[PDB]
């Protein structure tokens, strides 16, 4: 009947929506779903076959060119030939044929519509993409477009920082220096230096892969004598090697380690490569104003639901969210969190009293005060966290000797050097009774609270000096006056 016809047309509409989803996921992703099956099942087996095709992908990123497309066709067949010779990998056998199917479906769409054949990241009106705003699909469209410049930097920054810091070993220090140099200065030439450092990282990732697959399953040939086999004898020296990732045979290497760094090296490289392309609007205004009178002007938009509440919470974020993540840091109950304690209260009192009334000839100095005060502290504490756990895991002026020296060193480890935290490691009997006597809470890792804090403070300090918050202080001063 008519109800049957309407049900059929609803099913056809659903089929059209699903077809649109298939097309958009075909065009927008392309190699992501392949690259991740590549790594997830890489972790699963870890036998040589992966080596040729893992160095392959990293160099493919290091050859950002149309030659990259020859390596794309390599990703197409490489697997088919090696899989046939060796006879869920059988699913990958037909999955590479799906790449040719993707091209086949592209040709089908070419003859259907009378539009030019080109890639389209923005499927629905381009004007709405410039809107950046409320009410609809433009939310996921925003996830797409501002991944290119503004939200993309913060997303990749939080991704790399949090992932590597929760890994909490080796990499932790090099990328700690990366963080120090990135967050300390603000510059595009330093971004080009960072373009040359990510190029180095793109080689260093296959270095880590090769370190994990350095030898066939087992033949007991060489292991650089465990990094110069120092002079000590301990699981501490065992873990010195756990740390310098040199060879190490009897280990199921953490799959999470490889998945994290691989995926977060892919995202960062893509983000930075796009970053080099176009311009920016973050800090060029500040140098113009520097060269109590901020003069960026823009409309205040319309209060029509969603946008109202989004911009309203954006206003409140200065008070509740950032300081509350610092308060989670307060609950970190550490000697380093004590510095946070009498930093946060002063921030509340002084900052409120100071930029309620737009302090004269002190707004720029106050925003520098906030920037340095709540970025340098969190970076210094996050940098030492990994360094001090390195110190604890290894041997240096051991803290178990003498009576007065023993007491002083026990107090020192009580509040400062604490204990190492890593899932797999070992200890000996003497250190066992030493830790029994000194005692510790064995829970320190920063993944609980420091990561969200740092995320908020960077994400908002790149906003606290830009965009409409510069126009927001007008509301602050008007409210104070009235």
């Amino acid at each position: 009947h008519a109800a049957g016809d309407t049900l059929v047309k609803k099913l056809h509409k659903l089929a059209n929506q699903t077809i649109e989803l298939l097309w958009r996921f075909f065009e927008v992703h392309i190699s992501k779903i392949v690259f991740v099956i590549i790594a997830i099942f890489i972790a699963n087996n870890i036998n040589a076959l992966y080596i040729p095709l893992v160095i392959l992908l990293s160099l493919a990123i290091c050859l950002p060119s149309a030659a990259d497309g020859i390596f794309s066709l390599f990703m197409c067949a490489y697997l088919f030939l090696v899989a046939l010779s060796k006879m869920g990998v059988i699913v990958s056998i037909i999955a590479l044929a799906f790449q040719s199917i993707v091209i086949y479906r592209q040709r089908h769409y070419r003859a259907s519509l009378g539009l030019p054949e080109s890639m389209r990241a923005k499927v629905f009106p381009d004007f709405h993409h410039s809107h950046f705003d409320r009410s609809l699909k433009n939310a996921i469209q925003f996830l797409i477009d501002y991944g290119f410049y503004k939200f993309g930097l913060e997303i990749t920054m939080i991704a790399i920082g949090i992932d590597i810091f929760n890994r909490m070993d080796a990499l932790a220090a090099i990328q700690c220096f990366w963080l120090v140099l990135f967050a300390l200065n603000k510059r595009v030439f330093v971004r080009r230096i960072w373009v040359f450092y990510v190029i180095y990282m793109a080689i260093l990732y296959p270095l880590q892969f090769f370190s994990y697959v350095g030898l066939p399953p087992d033949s007991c040939i060489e292991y650089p004598w465990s990094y110069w086999i120092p002079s000590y004898s301990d699981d501490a020296r065992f873990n010195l090697s756990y740390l310098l990732n040199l060879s190490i045979y009897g280990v199921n290497w953490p799959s999470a380690y490889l998945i994290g760094d691989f995926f977060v090296l892919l995202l960062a490289s893509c983000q930075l490569a796009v970053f080099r392309r176009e311009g920016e609007d973050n800090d060029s205004i500040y140098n113009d104003g520097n060269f109590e009178n901020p003069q960026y002007d823009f409309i205040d938009t319309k209060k029509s639901y969603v946008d109202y509440f989004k911009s309203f919470v954006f206003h409140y974020g200065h008070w509740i969210t950032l300081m509350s993540t610092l308060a989670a840091g307060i609950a970190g109950t550490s000697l380093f969190a004590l510095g946070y304690i009498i930093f946060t209260l002063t921030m509340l009192w002084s900052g409120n009293n100071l930029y309620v009334m737009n302090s004269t000839l002190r707004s720029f100095e106050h925003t520098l005060k906030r920037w340095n005060a709540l970025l340098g502290y969190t970076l210094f504490t996050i940098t030492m966290k990994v360094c001090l756990q390195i110190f604890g895991c290894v041997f240096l002026s051991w803290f178990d000797q003498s009576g007065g020296w023993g007491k002083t060193l026990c107090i020192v480890r009580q509040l400062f050097s604490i204990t190492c935290v890593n899932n797999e490691c070992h200890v000996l009997k003497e250190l066992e009774d030493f830790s029994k006597a000194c005692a510790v809470e064995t829970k320190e890792g920063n993944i609980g609270f420091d990561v969200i804090a740092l995320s908020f403070l960077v994400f908002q300090i790149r906003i606290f000096h830009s965009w409409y918050f510069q126009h927001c202080m007008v509301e602050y001063r008007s409210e104070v006056i009235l």
């Binding site: 200890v427 066992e432 830790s435 029994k436 510790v440 064995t442």
Partner: protein
């Protein structure tokens, strides 16, 4: 057939605490349970 001196009970209770290890939380939980079991009996309800 006789009761237990408080010295022996104190020695047993003291030995129950130090049985664990520094890292594993399961060892701590086991020690807590074993100590909680003993405290329900006074020295006047234990027979050697």
């Amino acid at each position: 057939l006789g009761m237990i001196k408080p010295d022996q009970l104190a020695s047993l209770n003291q030995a129950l605490t130090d049985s664990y290890t520094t890292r594993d939380t399961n060892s701590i939980l086991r020690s807590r349970m074993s100590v909680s079991y003993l405290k329900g009996y006074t020295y006047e309800d234990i027979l050697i």
